[PDB]
Structures are given as structure tokens and as C-alpha cells.
Amino acid sequence: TRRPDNTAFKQQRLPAWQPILTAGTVLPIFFIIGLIFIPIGIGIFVTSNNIREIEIDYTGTEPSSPCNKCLSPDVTPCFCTINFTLEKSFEGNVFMYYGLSNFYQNHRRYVKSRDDSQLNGDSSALLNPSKECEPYRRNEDKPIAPCGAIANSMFNDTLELFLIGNDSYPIPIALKKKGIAWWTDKNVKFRNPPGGDNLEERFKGTTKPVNWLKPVYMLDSDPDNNGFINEDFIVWMRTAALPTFRKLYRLIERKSDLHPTLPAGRYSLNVTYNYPVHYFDGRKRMILSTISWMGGKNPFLGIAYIAVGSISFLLGVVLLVINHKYR
Amino acid sequence: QPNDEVVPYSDDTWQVKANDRKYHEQPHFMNTSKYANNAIKTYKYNAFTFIPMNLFEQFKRAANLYFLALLILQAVPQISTLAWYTTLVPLLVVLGVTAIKDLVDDVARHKMDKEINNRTCEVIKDGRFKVAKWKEIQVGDVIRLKKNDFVPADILLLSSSEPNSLCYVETAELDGETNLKFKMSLEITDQYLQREDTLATFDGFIECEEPNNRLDKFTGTLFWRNTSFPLDADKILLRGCVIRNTDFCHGLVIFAGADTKIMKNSGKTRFKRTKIDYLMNYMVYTIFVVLILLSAGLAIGHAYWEAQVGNSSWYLYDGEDDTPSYRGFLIFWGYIIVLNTMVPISLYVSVEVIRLGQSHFINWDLQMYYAEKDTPAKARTTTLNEQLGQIHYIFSDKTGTLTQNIMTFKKCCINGQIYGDHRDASQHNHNKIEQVDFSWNTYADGKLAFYDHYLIEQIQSGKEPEVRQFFFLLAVCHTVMVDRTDGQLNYQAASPDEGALVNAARNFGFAFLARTQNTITISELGTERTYNVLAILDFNSDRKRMSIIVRTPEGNIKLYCKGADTVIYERLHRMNPTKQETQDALDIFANETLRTLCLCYKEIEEKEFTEWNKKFMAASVASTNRDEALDKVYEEIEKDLILLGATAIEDKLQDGVPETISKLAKADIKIWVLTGDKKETAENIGFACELLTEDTTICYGEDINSLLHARMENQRQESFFPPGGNRALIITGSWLNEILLEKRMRTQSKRRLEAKKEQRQKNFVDLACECSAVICCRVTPKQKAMVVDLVKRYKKAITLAIGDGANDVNMIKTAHIGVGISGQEGMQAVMSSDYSFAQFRYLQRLLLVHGRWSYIRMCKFLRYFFYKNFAFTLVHFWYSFFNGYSAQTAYEDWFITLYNVLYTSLPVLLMGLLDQDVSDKLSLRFPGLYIVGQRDLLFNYKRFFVSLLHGVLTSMILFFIPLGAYLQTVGQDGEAPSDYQSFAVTIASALVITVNFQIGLDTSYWTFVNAFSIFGSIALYFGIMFDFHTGTASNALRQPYIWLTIILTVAVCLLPVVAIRFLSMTIWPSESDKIQKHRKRLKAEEQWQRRQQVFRRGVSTRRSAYAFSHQRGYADLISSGRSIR
């Protein structure tokens, strides 16, 4: 054999940088982070506090509330009227959510219980739902249109608000159900089955989910909002990450005038109790929040940044003195 | 009782035909043949044993068993998550990656064997000799060898060019001996198998002993010409022998292949596994146990969950009536799947890749490449790299490893004046003195580099005739032969010492020209003066001196004797004015690590010789005890010898040997010199190598045995010597057997015997390991392995074996790391070795650079590998409390597959190949950095749990910081990323950044590829998933809260790490850290300096530096006509 090549790689002498964790390179960063995470933590905290939010719980699990009568609905159509007041008028677009507590939408036996190909608008998969949605694959002789547990247990309460003015006449509040789902889900992931023009014919030879009261045909009068592309359907099928979640329900756009969208006063929430959750100690809530340029209302991030900024700054001082002690 | 001059092979029928291959190929011999082919096998995978034997060793690894278990589990339909047609391929893919790397090494050594099987020695396979590869030799082939031709196999010397079919062979490979030994042949075979034609028809039968490991003696018989002719070891040329000073010799192959006596002395090949290989097994066992506990802990939690919450959850109805206990049992296997990546599939492909890359840095090193012989290093096994940085003991050879097998005549004390120093004219002038001019001498050549002009004028001037007689003695007292076939006047010296002296005396003017059974024809300063030899008093180990009695042309009779300083000083005349001065010179030469012989002569009268001559003849003629009777008449004449002077022959060491030993002594590596050479030669090279200094007090086998009997008797632990002293051992091979005891009621006493032997072997290792140096001489190849074994068994030490030749194969195969000295003609130790470089000094870089880094790099890889997997995999464990312990992955399905192979694979592979704490120049200069590998400090079983605790804590922050920011409102709008898919891409995004910023903190050598892979992996994740996107990251990572959570999660994960790293460096800096801080201010690096002067006064002879490699029987050849044409 012959002389090895005198290449930088072969001889272990590639040009390289030797970083040393010196007091002039780790102390400043522990301070730069300290001086950045404090302002960010302060900005996050105050902005989230500025947000106006009202959370109304209407599960009716405990007595002395005007919804316990619906806990045992002798008659299926049951209604509750929860009264609440707004200390300060809301401004800008106001978002309506429905929050479910102790509702494991992230359970493995539940997250997988759906047929993505079917919901994508696949003709072949419409009549042959996959084994993933097995327990709700077929009802009597023909397959479910939105098979699976995820589509079966769809939140089916109807929440309505009324403003109680001087005349005490409940003024209905406009609620836009359009544009509450992810754009990609609305136009990419979820698509109606091809063929025909009227969805009645598209879903030929398919039954409704077992729990659903009415088929997918008329989830909405608008042809754009009914089918697999329904906004409420899509929002529910986007399974949550933790047992406690909240899904967008309705939008309350800014009023054309300068007046606040929800002027402060007395309000009444009219809810058609349909969704039962009291069996597994679940809670149901209606949340109203206001648009914010910094996402939503997240106090925890503001606290965390302050804690890390303080700890980082404190560590810089502790490291600085230790270095001086051992200098 | 034990003998200090013999190698103890004892303490460790066959039939052959001639030119008659068919007969001894008979079915009765055949077994399923009893006779082996002359080909040598060293590789492992021949044709088809690759799969059964590569996989068997493949599954010696813990995780390979682990992956196999997962494969079987994933094939069970009720719990299987994958199709089973894509989970087996990754196991095959990685197994093929390691199998291929093992095959490229095997084919490399298969080619190496072909080099020795293509040596092309002539054989009789037709009416006349025909060239033939070595492997084309079968037991019973008459062969022919020329000068300097390695003997293909143990052969019965039939004839030769020399008179009486003499053949001189050097056995420096079979044993460390550096001199030539003559092998005779049967008189009948000598006078009837000379001509080439008669060899072909030779039809002889040999009934000899079955193949054995006894190189010293051989018992057999030859039936030929209707008569039986006994054989002995003096007619058999072993396999490793090299034929010297013989134009051609004819032999009959007795054994061949693995039947050769040297090949039987090669140990058994064993599968060598690194120390960290054993650690990685226990570490995978630990993770497997933790995986079972966590899965069973979460499986119980699920059952307690389905009992009250799950059974009441109407939305969690699946139409299968399963009891909560059964559901929990069934999710136990669901967590085994989920948490399996806690030890990924790429653990061994990465370790496989790192070692392949590192072992190629050994091959490519230009500082380990010997240009003179054009021989680079070679890591012929690419599975033992980190262990080079864990060596505790080095067991070396000597002849050919620590020495160049070159002896030169350095100095000479004459009449008390020491000659050899740098001098000019009649007095010293300057150190810068040019080489002496020998042009005035017709016979002299330029090989002798003598830097002294004072001696030359003394030779030429002649005012001090004793100077002339000093060199006439060196030219007469020898027993070498002379070749003048073309007027070259070449000397064929059996002993290297005789060659150096006779050549040295030839250059000074007194040249030995011709020899005869009765006369010698030395020429003195151009004058041809033919002396008459009257008796050559042969040399033997116990005599330690050779003498010659000659009659000068005038008529006077003189006796010339040269030998050990001790034996001669007991025979000097009472009147010797130079006795004191010469004794001082022998002390000066002894202090310089040279081989000293004293020269003396006496004046013999005509009448005094005649009475002694008749006595001498009566001793020679008496064949009953010719050797014993001769020694008596030898002593009768060597009574009053006038002292002439001394000599000093310097056994040259390989360059760098004394420096390497000192450097590896600072690295705390103990070097033992296990050699098969004589005791005087082995002891001298210990002094030349600086292993033994005047500070050390040397203990021999006699002293060691006495100490060990004391402890045996005391008991019927305490140090054998005082702690502050400096000591060394020179244990002969015969004394090593003596001190190690290696020289129904039948089975009952066996335990006490073995219990006694086991205690005595442990005591010796504790005695040997308390000494600064240990030299074992006259040891068999089996004894070389035994000493390595004892150190492994009783000191639990990593051992390195370095040597050349066949005798060093056993300890090369027995040591943890086995190095072979390549570049020479003999390649027996190279094939069986693990690494191979041409020079001893290159051991500095193998350990202090390649070995030291390989440990640092493998440990850094191991520390980070089990980080970035617990951090990734324990997120599924923390999520289990918030999904009903349902075994739901916190990440997307695609992320899990690509994480271990595409998002965190490359960064750590490049670290394992390129990282460097200190420069190579700065790691040789500071050998003390090596002790970190001795003690196993960089990766303990406690550093393994600290990395686990690093991933366990990192996983908590990776999951619970995104959780805290999501339990509340997080960017709640139309495109609100509060769902599970947005959950997955925040922890995955934070995870990828955190682990890839951690390898940046770990890396201390930021090459461009190091920086490119760290950010290339981060950028690859943020780009690759977009190709998949359905559309989860298109909205999750565009939100200010999803990026304020990712930044916060990373900062909390890395800032505490940086603080701990800085504190531990500021408070308890390592050896490497101190050197990096002062790297620029380090300038004083003095080259290694030999101890220039250790001169002392007070003791007449503190140490006898005598050394002479020579053998008996050579004088008997000249006395008769056996060696004379």
C-alpha cells in the first residue's frame, strides 16, 4: 500500500471553531435572555389581562340553576335560560365558543375512529367505510355517511343570546356560523362526495350516524355549509389536544356603527339542551371573547416568561459571582 | 533447578511419504483428511458460514434481541399496529449494514492470506522441480528453498549447497533469538540426494510424532534404502525459519498448514468485544426493564381509568364488552409499541458507522505511515476503537518490535583508555566531528560510522602495539565464516555480536580473510599473515566465553579469549595494571546500555601446550561425555590471562522506542516486555529502552520465588515491597513456570491443587503489578499468552499486545487489542492482529490520539444518543395522564418514523467522527489526558443514568410548557391551533430544536459539516413536513403564541444545561479544560532527553552488562571439516 492522501478530512485537521464556555460568552446570554423575557412576559401578561372574556357554565349538574330540569329530559326538546351581565361592553369581533370539560377527544380509541378518505369526498370510500370507524360503520344495511365515534358524538346544542334593553324585549344577536373552520379543512381536507348537484342524490344508499337526529343532507340550508363541509361538523372533527377544550361556535362581527358589538347590560343565553355529558362528570360552557392581535388570552405564557426571565437574570448573577469567586 | 538458558516447550503415529501424494491420501487417513494442506486460514466467513455465524455474533448485542422481540410483538394481530411487512425490513436493513461492514473486513483479510499462499516455493510434482504456490504443498512433497526464503512448512532437511548438507536458519520469528542455528542432515541423505534428478525418484517413509507444539525437540524415524534412520530436531526446519547463508536447501515436507509446530502454538481465535460493547448491553437491558415497568404502570392506570371514567363515557363506546382489567392488559402492549423508540433502531448502525469512520482515520494517518518500508497503519478490525483509549497494560516483544535487529560496534576500552568518543587528532576538539576516513584501508567499507580519529592514528602509528593486538583478537577469536565468491569478502556471522566485532575489526585494518580446518589467514594493515589454529575453545551458555589457541608464523603459541567480564576477571593474571581502569570502562559502557565483552590473552610455552594438547585430544575423542570432559580441559588452560580491554556493541532500538515508553508512562500505561530471547539480551534492551534505570533494583526468578513462598507460608493485601521503592522483574521462562506452579480421592485433591494454583497466580500478578517494569525472557508463545491472561483475569485490565513473528500471535489473539508490527518480510503477527503499523513509536498516536479520541467520541455519542430518545419518547408518557392512559402518541405518525433517522441522525454521527477536545499535537504533549480512559470516567453506569435523567427532565418541559400554554386560550381565531395536530407540531418543533441545540453545546469541534448538520437537521424538519402538508403546520407555526411557546420551551430546556456546563467547568475544570484555557501560553516543550550521565564511584561492578547471542557447536564444525568446503 501507498502513502495516504494528505487531505484535511483524512488527517483530522478540518478547519474548525473551538467554542469555550467562557464567562464572556455565557454570562451575557443569561442576561440578554433575562432582559428580553421580562418585557415579553410583561407584554403577554398585560395584553391577555386587557382581553374581556365571560365564561358561562350551563351543564346544569347542580340544583338551584335554571338548567337542571334538562339533566333528565323527559321530553327530548329541553331549554335553559341562563342570565348573565357584562360589566364592560365588548368591542371588535366577538367569538363564541362551547367548552367541554373532562371530554377526552384525544383518547386513542376515539381519535382514530374516523375515515379520512370518506370525508375527503371519495366515491369508493363512501359506501365502504374503513374498519377504523368499525362500531359505527353500518347502522342497519347501509353505511354511515360520517362514520366513526368522532362524527357520531357531535356537539348538538343550539346556543342563542338575547340582549335585554330598557324595554326588556329580548333583542336577538346576530351570529355568523360561516368561516369558523380551518380554511384548509373547509376546502382541502373535507369535501362533499362528487356526482350530481343536490346532496340528496350524492349520498345515495347511506344512512345517518346512529346518534344524529337528522342526516347530513340538511345540516344547513346553504349548499355551501351542508354535507361533509359543514362548519360545525368540521370544527368538531378537529379533535382537541387535552380533555378540557373549547371549539369555535359563532362569530359576532363588529357593528357597522361605532357602538360596541355587545353593549354592557343584561343578557340571556337560550340553549337547547341536547348533548348529555353529566354521566362522565363533564361540564359544558359558553365562552365569549374579543379579538386580540396577540392571539388570545394566555396569562400562563406571561407568567412563564417572567419566571424564566427572573431565573435567567438571577442565574447570571449567581454565575457572575461564582466566576469572580473562582477567578 | 530451573534452567535460565532454555525455552520450556515441554511444560505446555504420523506417516509421510515422498513424491507419493496418492498413498497418504487413502480413505483410512481421510476423516469426515487427517493431513492438512499447506494453506493457512485466518478469515472467518469462507463461503456459506457467513449467515449462521455473522448473525450469531450479531445477536451478541442486547438491542438486536430487543428489536427482535418488538418484531414478534408487532406481528400479533390483536395488538399489531403495523402491517409486519415493513417492520422487519428496518431490522434487516440495519443488520445488513453491520454484516456488510463485517464482510469488507473479512475479504480484506482473505486477500491478506492469499499473499502468504502465493509465496511460490519450488516443489517436485513432475520429473523435475516446478515452481508452486505455498498452498500447493501437501505432506510429503520434496521442495527446494534458496537464500532468505521462508520455510513453507516443517521439512526434513535432505541436502543443501553447504558441505555435509548444512543449513543455517535464523529463528527470530519462531523465537526472539537473533542468531543463526545450523541444521545438519543424515549422512546417507547427504550423499545420495544431492543432484536434482535423484530427489524426484526419492521414495522414503517417515514415521514421526503426531503434530505438536514442541519446537525444541522432534522424534521420528526414516525408513529408506532398507534401513531405519532416526531423526531429531537438528534435521527439521520449522515453518517460520528463514534460510541464511545457504544457496539452496532441499527438504521433505513433514507437516503443513495448521499442523506445523509453530501454527499449533498459535492460540485460539476469539471474538473480541469492547468494554463499552458490554456497557451498551447492560444499558439496553436497563431500558428494557424500565420500558416494561412504565408500560405496566400506565396499563394499570388505564384500567383504573376505564373503570370509572371510560365506562361512563358514552362517546367512548366501541361495541366490545371488555372489562377494565382486560383493557388495561391490552394497552400494556400498546405502550410497548409507543415507548419502544426509547432505544431506537439506529443505535448500532450509528456505532457501526462511527467505528468504521474512526478506524479509517488510523488507516489514513500520515504520522503513522512508515515511508522507508512504504507501510501505513491498518485497523484491520473496525469494531475495537474506543478500547484503544482504555488500555491499561502493553505486552511487547523485543526482537523486531523494540529493536531493528542491527548491532553496531560503538566503543572499546584499551589499556584503560576508552575509544569511541567524538574526537579528532590526538585530543578532543569539538563535538561536531566528521566521520573517520577508512579510505586508507583496502578492505574497509562505509557501513561503520566511527567518530574518533585518535584511535586511527594509534592503529596506524603503532607506538602502542596493544591497540593492534586488541583488534587482531577480534579478528581471530571469532568463529564466523567468510565468502569471497567474487572478491567481495562478505562475512557470514552466526552471532550478531561476532559479526559486529569482526566487521568492526576489519574496517580498522585487521581483516579476517580465509579460514581452514587448521589455519586462519587474518591480514593486518595490508600484511597477509596466516596463523595456525591449534584449538578453538567453543562457547556455551554456562561458559560465557570463547577462546582460541593459535601459533603465530614465527612459531610462538598464543591464546586469545573474549567473554563475560565476570568469568574473565576470575581468570586474570595477578599482575594486571589495566584491571582497575578496564573495570571502570565496563561500568561506563554498562551505564550507557551497551553489550560488553572483555578481551584477554596469555602466553603459552611449547612444552606447556604439549602436555595440555594430549589432554585436550583425549577430551575431544572421548564421545561418552565429550562436552563435559572438554569443559575440564578448557578450564585447565584459561588460568592466567592478560587483560587487553573491552568492547561495546550497541543493539539498535527502533527509533522512538525510548520516547514512546516514557510518554506512555505518563499516560499511566504499564509496559511489559515478554520476549523469547536470552536473559542478558532481554535485560540489556530493558536498559536501552529506559524501562530499567540505575534507580531500579532488579529481582530475578530466584528472588520472586522466595517472596511468594513467604506469603504462601504466612497464610498457612500486604505489599511485597515497600511502597516508595523502585523495582523491576526479569523472570525467565523456566522460572515463570516454577513460580506459577506450572511445571473419590483422585478428584478431591484436585480442588486443593487448583485452589493452590489459583492463589499462586493471583499472588504473582500482585507482585508483578507492583513493579515499575517486568521483563519475561525465554518464554514460549503459550507462556506469552498466559501472562496476558493472568493480567486480564486477576487485574481486570485492558491489555495490548504488540509484536511480530509467529511467537507473538498467541498473545496478540489473547490480548484485548492486538497490534502487529508490519513492514517486514514476516507477516504472521500482522494477519492475526487487530491493528498493524510498521513501527513501535507509532503507538503514541494510536493510543494518545486515535484511542483517546475514540473513547471521548464514542462516550459523547452514547451520552447524547440516550438523551435525544428519552426526551422524544417520554412525551408519550406524560401525555398519558391527559388522554386517559390510552397510548395516544403526542406526535404525528410521520414524525415518529423520521425523527430517529432524519431529524437527529446526522448531527451525532459527525460528532462521533470529528470531535476533538485538544489538538493531536497537544494530546501527545500531554499524555496525562489519557488516564480519563483508564478509569472509565467519561461514561460510567452513573453517567448513563444522568443522561437518562437529562432526557426525563427535558421531556417534562417539552410537554408541560406547550400544555400550560394550551390549557388556556392560544391564538383562538378562525384558524385556531388549539387542537391535537397543533399540539403535536409544537412539541415536535420544540423537541427538534432542543435536541439539535444540545448537540451544538456538546460539540467542541465545530467543523462546517458539524454546523451544517446541526442546522441542516433543524431546517430539514421545518421544510420536509411542509411537503406532507394535512395542513397542520401551515397554521400552527404562523401564530405568535405557537412561537412564543416554542422559544420558551427551548430556553427552559437549554439554559439550565448551559449553567451546569459552565459551573462544572469553572469549579471543577477537567484536564482538557485547563489545557484549552492556556493553549496559547504553552510554549516550553523540550524533546525527550536520555540520561546523559549516571556516573558513580564506590562499587567495583554494580551491574554486569555482558550480553552475547551465540550457540554451541560452531567450533566443532571448524575443528572438523563440516563447515569447510
Ligand SMILES: CCCCCCCC(=O)OC[C@H](COP(=O)(O)O[C@@H]1[C@H](O)[C@@H](OP(=O)(O)O)[C@H](OP(=O)(O)O)[C@@H](OP(=O)(O)O)[C@H]1O)OC(=O)CCCCCCC
Ligand atoms: C434547574 C435544576 C436542574 C439541575 C439538575 C441537577 C443536576 C443534574 O443532574 O443534571 C441533569 C442533566 C445533566 O446533564 P449533563 O450531562 O450536561 O451534566 C453534566 C455536565 O455535562 C458536566 O460537564 P461534562 O463533564 O459533561 O463536560 C459534568 O461534569 P462533571 O462530571 O465533571 O461533574 C457533570 O457530571 P456529574 O453530574 O458530576 O456526574 C454533569 O453536571 O441535565 C441538566 O443538567 C439539567 C436538565 C434539567 C433542565 C431543567 C429542569 C427544570
Ligand SMILES: *[C@@H]1O[C@H](CO)[C@@H](O[C@@H]2O[C@H](CO)[C@@H](O[C@@H]3O[C@H](CO)[C@@H](O)[C@H](O)[C@@H]3O)[C@H](O)[C@H]2NC(C)=O)[C@H](O)[C@H]1NC(C)=O
Ligand atoms: C344529540 O346528541 C346526543 C348524543 O350525541 C343524542 O343522544 C343519543 O340519541 C340516540 C338516538 O337519538 C340514542 O341512540 C339510541 O336511541 C334509541 C331510541 O331510538 C335507544 O332506544 C337506544 O338505547 C339508543 O339510546 C343514544 O343513546 C343517545 N345518546 C345519549 C348519550 O343520550 C341526541 O339524540 C342528539 N339530539 C339531537 C337533536 O341531535
Ligand SMILES: *[C@@H]1O[C@H](CO)[C@@H](O)[C@H](O)[C@H]1NC(C)=O
Ligand atoms: C332570567 O331572565 C329572564 C328574562 O330574561 C327572567 O324571566 C327570569 O326571571 C330570570 N331568572 C333569574 C334566575 O334571574
Ligand SMILES: *[C@@H]1O[C@H](CO)[C@@H](O)[C@H](O)[C@H]1NC(C)=O
Ligand atoms: C329559546 O329558543 C327556542 C328555540 O328556538 C324558542 O322556542 C324559545 O322561544 C326561546 N326562548 C326561550 C326558551 O325563552
Ligand SMILES: [Mg+2]
Ligand atoms: Mg519478534
